[PDB]
Design a protein around this ligand. Structure first.
Ligand SMILES: Nc1nc2c(ncn2[C@@H]2O[C@@H]3COP(=O)(O)O[C@H]3[C@H]2O)c(=O)[nH]1
Ligand SMILES: Nc1nc2c(ncn2[C@@H]2O[C@@H]3COP(=O)(O)O[C@H]3[C@H]2O)c(=O)[nH]1
Lengths: 202, 202
């Protein structure tokens, strides 16, 4: 992407060793980040040292967007390297100058936000929907470890139709295909016809 | 606000009476709305026909931006007028033009997408996390339907702790409490301690 390269060439590129902390909750927000490689966890820590993960962000995602539109904000949360990371940084002021010169870089930042909203809104429904989603996920992990599963470079590959999944967990063909699609979008599987690759099953 | 006025003059205004329907789930998205006056309900319907209100938008809120960034996507929710509303509208293709001459109108839209992203829950979980989420959801359904549950104006209410849920599903109280917070934010339950209200279910 030329609009991205052109953006990058105005940024300071920083390398974060894995599990180092890029952002501390409470600090003044002045920098926009973009992830060149690697991945991060957005998280919250209580006073006892218990964590909750709010979000994972990966290559292509920005971090800090809201701070671009609301000057003088504190960091809402910590951000931690989930793997070694390369991360491009630019000040909010400088990014605001790039915007005036090239409205495209803001469309890139906005699209990236829209796709994150779309992907997470595929999971949303009521408690019966979460229940059926969980039972599908659990079926896919079980199948991944049965003797008919095949070793695949990304995980384990299995063969099963939407109809059979629906009979195992009790829902329609349609509700199954909706949930496998939410799962691919979460990058937890890839699916083509009846071939499903379940990622990360060793 | 000059930026909003200059944008409002490039839009057609339409008046929408209460309970009218601005946006239909699944129809082609090619238009951006902005609320000039009034409020609206963003919603989905379950497998039978019950409604789950995702959110309320009010005057000054964009609606329907998601199609702007992506090849012909379809509306992902219904949008309905809660009070009567005056609503500005403009085609995607025309709005992208306004962006090239005036990015500051994109900044207005993009700031709202960013505030929403920052409050959006349910963003994370691999298959095993979805499984334990689904089982917690099914456990709240089971409990709320049991012969000892108490009625409540918005669903059923049960007395149960995080640790007790954990014992039923096999996981730690901490993992239960994290998932209950996500279920709260989704407006599915209220779980402010030792009583959980499971909405809309008996
Ligand atoms: N608070 C919060 N921040 C998130 C979330 N997901 C991604 N982030 C990003 O993490 C950033 C942390 O610093 P900021 O508060 O500036 O901006 C936050 C966001 O851009 C989330 O679910 N909650
Ligand atoms: N799906 C969904 N849409 C929302 C939500 N909040 C606001 N919206 C708006 O509802 C609109 C539905 O049509 P779009 O998909 O075009 O864009 C969506 C958003 O602008 C929400 O929580 N979920």
């Amino acid at each position: 992407d030329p609009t991205l390269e052109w953006f990058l060439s105005h940024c300071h590129i920083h390398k974060y060793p894995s599990k180092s902390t890029l952002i501390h909750q409470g600090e003044k927000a002045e920098t926009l980040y973009y992830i060149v490689k690697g991945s991060v966890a957005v998280l919250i820590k209580d006073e006892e040292g218990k964590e909750m993960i709010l979000s994972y962000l990966n290559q292509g995602d920005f971090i800090g967007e809201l701070g671009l539109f609301e000057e003088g904000q504190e960091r809402s949360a910590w951000v931690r390297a989930k793997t070694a990371c390369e991360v491009a940084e630019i000040s909010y002021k400088k990014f605001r100058q790039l915007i005036q010169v090239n409205p495209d870089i803001l469309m890139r930042l906005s699209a990236q936000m829209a796709r994150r909203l779309q992907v997470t809104s595929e999971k949303v429904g009521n408690l019966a929907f979460l229940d059926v989603t969980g039972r599908i996920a659990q079926t896919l992990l079980n199948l991944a470890k049965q003797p008919d599963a095949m070793t695949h470079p990304d995980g384990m590959q299995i063969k099963i139709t939407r109809q059979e999944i629906g009979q195992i967990v009790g829902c329609s063909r349609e509700t199954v295909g909706r949930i496998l699609k939410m799962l691919e979008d979460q990058n937890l599987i890839s699916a083509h016809g009846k071939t499903i690759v379940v990622y990360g099953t060793r």
